[model samples]
Target chain A: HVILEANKIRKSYGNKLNKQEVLKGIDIHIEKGEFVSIMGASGSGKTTLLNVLSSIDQVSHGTIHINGNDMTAMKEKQLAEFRKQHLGFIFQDYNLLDTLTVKENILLPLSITKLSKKEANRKFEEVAKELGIYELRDKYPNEISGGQKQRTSAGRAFIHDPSIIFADEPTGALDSKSASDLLNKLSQLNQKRNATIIMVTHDPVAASYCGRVIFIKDGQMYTQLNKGGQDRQTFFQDIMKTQGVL
Target chain B: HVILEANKIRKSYGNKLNKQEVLKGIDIHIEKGEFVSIMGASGSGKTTLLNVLSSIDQVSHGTIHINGNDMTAMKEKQLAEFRKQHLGFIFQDYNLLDTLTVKENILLPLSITKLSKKEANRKFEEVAKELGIYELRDKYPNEISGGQKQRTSAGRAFIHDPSIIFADEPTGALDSKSASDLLNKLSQLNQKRNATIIMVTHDPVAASYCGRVIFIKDGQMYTQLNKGGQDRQTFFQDIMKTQGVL
Candidate 1:
């Protein structure tokens, strides 16, 4: 049931003269129906680990698997197809298409996957209703509130029903109220539909929604927590304490 | 010293059958070196007003002026040029170029203009150092953290030194900690560099950074508040209460 696996991943940038090691070495596994958060300090490799897992960037060393497919060896074309097929991405910023209406943005991944318009529309309404943004489907990204924008982004990310969804700072840009709302909806998706989620975030509150959290520091897995028996608020506090900020 | 002004602006979408009046009617203005936040409910016309003021969408009725240039009737090409010269934008999504390095993403706006490479590099280094992301220039968008992404987006928005910056929920994707950091940096941009900023947001916390806030309901102006004499926390509470959430 493992949805994603990053095995001994490593990444560095620039030449020997100007070289920089953004990600040292990291390993993690995300299972089906899991909501896992990646947390770390400013210079930690959370985002780099996400990129390696998502195939958004090539690793200098290591391998990644998505739903049992060897993602590390995929060519650009294959990866593009893989991204459009097996993965859904939600960023700190919603990344909704300005030119496309909200419904279209939510329907985009399905369209690329060759699903019928009618089928996509059905999924859109279901997802939109669950996220409590049903009325926003006709609106453009620039016409919605910050909370709604993030909600719509979440709706879109889940519409595809992918094996896994990867988010980089999913609730990083919202106020406490809005952030809590967005996180609740994301948690619902993970529970109700068994969607696998791997999110990289610096906020303890955002990390609490995850069923498990892995902390990366200095390019390696430093610590982890399982939320299988913990409430979100309690988990959030624990995450904060781990970061020495509470 | 006014950088942006909107007098009785209106906008609607769809044909006669599907037509919906998105912006009922609105009026707002911001002076140079001012930080203004537009606060509203989910369906309020904050973002529609933002687009009209930014000239990304045309106004159905009303006048818009940026730096004393009337934009109500400017042709598309003229408006495009005007946007490049006088306006900057930070969307909820970072909108960084996936293929470009962090430095390249920051300098994209400058590239859109006629600035030479040398001039652009100068601006990049200066802003990069101020934002504390100079060490990550060679990294790709996928290589950095969300805060780094937002900072990079800020660099892109401000590198050209536009007279006005339009942010649509710039912190919508960040957690409270990262969001506060972003707002603080933006506050510095306003206080130290005297950058004019207009942001449309739902989070009162983000509005705390603004010098003033205008509330919108059903597309028209509902109320206005000034933070010129108050700190961010107090201003934020007032704005939240004004919106009736607290």
Candidate 2:
């Protein structure tokens, strides 16, 4: 079933007199529990497309439905509530609070929820340990390495139990082993935890770990590749080939 | 045999009556053709120590000499020329110019040098190709990925043929494969080109690639480890053990 869908999505910037269309009539449909990657060259509009789809930015035209609700039709307050209930975000540049400890930051969304104190702690441990940041729970964001901080961000995103995760270049700054470790962790979250992941990445290797890879070009959908039953190496080759053409 | 040497280095900030010393007392001696790692906790004065050593800042006490001249004894004008002549620097946060193309940025140092245009071009090509960024030379910095931008920075740092390269967390934002590939390139520069490297890193694995690891704690030198024929894994384990104690 479609968990997230967009039809003829259009997004633009600048004033009414001189606007630049970044997402020109794009269409998207993401199935439940699918690990997906959106990729493109620089200035190809992939990020702009995601910004509109994630409802972080307003679309100039068309409508988006996430979890069977029309996100574009909702008011700001309702949309915020809707996003809090169903969507999670992770960014390469980090959106974590500087003043909070890792544990404190990870539990922010939970504090706003109706979860019990005991229940919150239990879930915190599970999420923190899953992302290998349990030991760093007490530390501030300034004290950890980049990979640890990224994992801490991961823990925070997963703790809320959102219906879908939106990650942009999550492994853009890790070592090979660390990147692989993070990708495997995301895979586990997608498989064992039944997470519906939608990520935007530039690396073909990183995209190979996804169930499908979608390419954006010139403010439109260029093509997409489904992993199907193919092995990782084959999927990687296909993505690379497609990217070469792109 | 020492190219860089320091004795009882101390640095402080704040007013004359109430200054806070960041480097209590430290000593360093770096020989030619050596790759060294400096590791420490956050706010442990590692960066302050490097600042003093690199002549980017001053020490409250003690003397630092590079290539037989006292850095502390030079005037601002003389120091700038001296630095341009002997020192190269790479920062994790990037100091690349936004306006310049990769090739233009890499050749900035040579613009002040007496090298002929043909010689400079030859050297630029060699350095750019060695770092695997020859294809990106014509592109502006904004048009490239993080890893490629870093490689461009590396190219710029190595272009001047400085006596020693000071890289602070050079692989701090790269993926494992990108980090290793960069390390191998640095190793090639260190070995084949006889470049001396001094890198400050928080990652034990990155530190293990060096010939020596120096630990700083509470504004002073705590301990040091020598690779001395150990395999990378063993060296990494030793660094980890020391960091655990730290």
The DockQ scores of all candidates, in the order shown, are: 0.05, 0.03
On DockQ, the leading prediction is 1
lDDT of 1 at B83: 82
Off by over 4 Å in 1: A1-246, B112-119
CAPRI class of candidate 1? incorrect
After TM-score superposition, what is the CA distance of residue B201 in candidate 1 from its true location, in Å?
0.6
lDDT of each: 0.73, 0.78
Native contacts recovered, each model:
0.00, 0.00
lDDT by residue for model 2 (B1-246), tens: 699899998877766544455677788887888898888644456677778888999877899988778888879999998888888888877788988888888899888767689989989988877787888777777667666777887888888788888978776555455677888888778887777899987666677789878887667777878878887887776776666543
TM-score of chain A of 1: 0.90
RMSD of 2: 11.5
lDDT of 2 at A54: 80
TM-scores for all candidates: the values are 0.53, 0.55
Candidate 2 residues lying further than 4 Å off, grouped into runs, are A16-18, B1-246
